[PDB]
A paper describes a structure:
Type II DNA topoisomerases are essential enzymes that catalyze topological rearrangement of double-stranded DNA (dsDNA) to maintain chromosomes in an appropriate state. In particular, DNA gyrase introduces negative supercoils into covalently closed dsDNA molecules using the free energy generated by ATP hydrolysis. The GyrB subunit is comprised of three domains: the N-terminal [name] domain (GHKL family), the transducer domain, and the C-terminal TOPRIM domain. Here we report the structures of bacterial GyrB43 in complex with (i) the pre-hydrolysis analog ADP⋅BeF3, (ii) the post-hydrolysis ADP⋅Pi and (iii) the product ADP.
Structures of type II topoisomerases have been determined previously for archael topoVI-B' in complex with various nucleotides and for human topoII (htopoII) in complex with AMPPNP and ADP, highlighting some of the structural changes occurring along the ATP hydrolysis pathway. In contrast, human topoisomerase II shows a semi-open ADP complex characterized by an 8° outward rotation of the transducer domain when compared with its restrained/closed AMPPNP conformation. Thus, the structure apparently represents an ADP⋅[name] mimic of the post-hydrolysis state and the domain rotation may well be of functional relevance (see also below). Interestingly, also human topoII may undergo a similar structural transition as inferred by the comparison of the respective AMPPNP and ADP⋅[name] complexes. As for bacterial gyrase, the pivot of the motion is at the center of the interface between the C-terminal [name] domain helix and the transducer β-sheet, but the direction of the rotation axis is different.
Author numbering:
A (entry chain B): 29 to 276, 287 to 344, 352 to 424
B (entry chain A): 29 to 276, 288 to 338, 354 to 404, 407 to 422
Write the structure that this text describes.
Amino acid sequence: SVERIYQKKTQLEHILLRPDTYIGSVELVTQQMWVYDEDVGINYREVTFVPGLYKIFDEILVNAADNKQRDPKMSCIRVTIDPENNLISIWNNGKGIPVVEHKVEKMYVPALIFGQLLTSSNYDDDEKKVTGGRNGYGAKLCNIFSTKFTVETASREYKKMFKQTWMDNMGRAGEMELKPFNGEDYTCITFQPDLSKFKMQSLDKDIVALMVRRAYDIAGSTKDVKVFLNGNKLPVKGFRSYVDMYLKKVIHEQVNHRWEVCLTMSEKGFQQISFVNSIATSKGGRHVDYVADQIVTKLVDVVKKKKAHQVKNHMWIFVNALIENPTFDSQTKENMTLQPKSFGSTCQLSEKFIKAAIGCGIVESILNWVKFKAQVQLN
Amino acid sequence: SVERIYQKKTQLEHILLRPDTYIGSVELVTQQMWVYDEDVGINYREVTFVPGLYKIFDEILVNAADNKQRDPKMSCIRVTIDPENNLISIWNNGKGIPVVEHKVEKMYVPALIFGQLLTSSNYDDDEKKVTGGRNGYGAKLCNIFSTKFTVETASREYKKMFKQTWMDNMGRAGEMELKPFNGEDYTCITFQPDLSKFKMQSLDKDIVALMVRRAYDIAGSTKDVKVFLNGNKLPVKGFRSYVDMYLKVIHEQVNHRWEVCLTMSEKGFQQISFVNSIATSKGGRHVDYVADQIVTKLVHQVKNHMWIFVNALIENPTFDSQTKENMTLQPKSFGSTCQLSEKFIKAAIGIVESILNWVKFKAQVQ
Ligand SMILES: Nc1ncnc2c1ncn2[C@@H]1O[C@H](COP(=O)(O)OP(=O)(O)O)[C@@H](O)[C@H]1O
Ligand SMILES: Nc1ncnc2c1ncn2[C@@H]1O[C@H](COP(=O)(O)OP(=O)(O)O)[C@@H](O)[C@H]1O
Ligand SMILES: [Mg+2]
Ligand SMILES: [Mg+2]
């Protein structure tokens, strides 16, 4: 009775019992957002989907992009989505995971970091890294919310390939397969999400449209990384070309190795599209405020010569950023809360960018509008 | 090298290493919100505070309120805030925690549920409870982020009193003290928050003003519970009187689980709400459920004239984040409904100002 009332849970039990604490809502939500629809392409519409499901997909995708930082020679990511077989796989090149036994934990590294909770190569903050990874949960969460989860990685350096399958919400695992290897390194994560945990029958149009858009995001946000979807190379060559998809006048600057900015006029209020370490910061954050307010200030002062949030409300801004040890207001990670002083870099836009921005069709809209309101009489 | 690169953490290490995942930001934020200032009382202003520090306080306060559901005879909560001694204590009456050894976990229950992670009496969802407690973290998180954390609880039923102190971020514990007991049951949690973890020198005005407001919220959101702050009874007798403090209005206690107040807003849509005594500052489906019901009867422009206050008891509530400012459970799974009476609805009809739309018989001319 005392023993029935007061309980202790294992870590694994707890995640399944309280999923929203780890992956966010396991219920449907409906909201407006950009997705990539088949035949139509990038568009803004109402979408109904489960955040938790999006999240576990996003964890594996971001992990692939994280590997770019670990190994700049990485050049490709391949994504496969198969609704009929309820099957998703995410492949990447560049250095594989060390296929070797961990001397402290007494298991092979891949099995450790995909099969045991609280495991990461990003737990040392002294190293100052710009990965999306930070907590050591992501890959495990995908595993816990999958009926089958397969890890395959190949390490030339250790001359071996590792392959292992987990099943039933990481409740059991198949035998670990090792083989000799000396090819080019790859990692492939293949999983079948547990749709009953998300109250879904299949990977419907909406969730797929989101997942597909993330592939495009990765193509846009990473450097010198080709992205394939299913089989086809995505026609996105860097951030500029990514931004072009959203448009049918645009100002651009690659400020430095960690910041890239595009700006155009908005007629629907302040808009932002942004990324931090290849994470989609859909609700913005201090990184967007940092760049935007810098532009706002300069444009307000030009307007003063002949109003602040009003200037900002005419802006559509696109930001790709690499931030050290980023922080977010929730799981979901839609809003990045780290202060600019801790970013690890600055982003001072060039005078050329600012000058082009003063043109751009913007200070003009505001001035015409303000001249107009002076002409209006209410009768 | 492999072993230095790829690391595994204990649960405890992880919480201290990645606190914001468990308690929210351990950095200052600045935002506008309602607080209770000394001499001035309830007011809306800019506030600078650390959310994580607010949370650990909140966890212990909500736990005290949760005990009401466990024991309806509970009548009192006493809160003590002492900035100088960096000392907070939260006392409640009603049934104490069973002072007895847990047969499976092989320790006394109070030590188990305040000293071990992932421990709760709210893990059975068949029981359909309306507590704020759900995850079995809260009390531990307060302990983990305190230099000293003391649990004292007294159970007539088991004829014993338990007392134990943890120290250094739950890194060590003192000896457990047991004594015979036959008085009236109480539980008192007394802690000193680890201010260095929150980069603070003391419990300043702002955080104290937040904490004090929560005391008032509890007085407002719980039923037949007197609340004391530093020895003074708070003058809040139920939700209506709580709402009045904001307004120096139409009301309905719809049922045992829903209470609603509505007035006009001139500042856009405003909401003040609670789910199981948790402060849902950013709202949720519970506020949408009540509000949209009102809106529909009179029709976003309507909604933007509303200032609504909602106190709800929800079964197994769910939230965006760890700050629990936004409650996400869908109305089908609430465990109750909240159909406002025709009287309320009628009193609500005295916002309707077709007056602005009418007067929008304007002519823009040059
Ligand atoms: N595609 C990949 N390539 C190389 N390493 C990977 C890949 N995916 C995951 N990892 C490694 O395994 C860990 C995955 O853990 P994850 O749970 O995603 O934690 P993190 O918060 O570190 O990203 C990482 O720390 C990383 O070292
Ligand atoms: N004031 C109290 N009176 C009685 N029991 C308490 C009190 N505070 C905490 N508890 C018990 O200890 C547990 C506290 O754990 P907590 O960490 O707050 O998780 P949760 O509240 O989610 O159950 C509760 O489940 C409850 O059984
Ligand atoms: Mg990761
Ligand atoms: Mg609690």
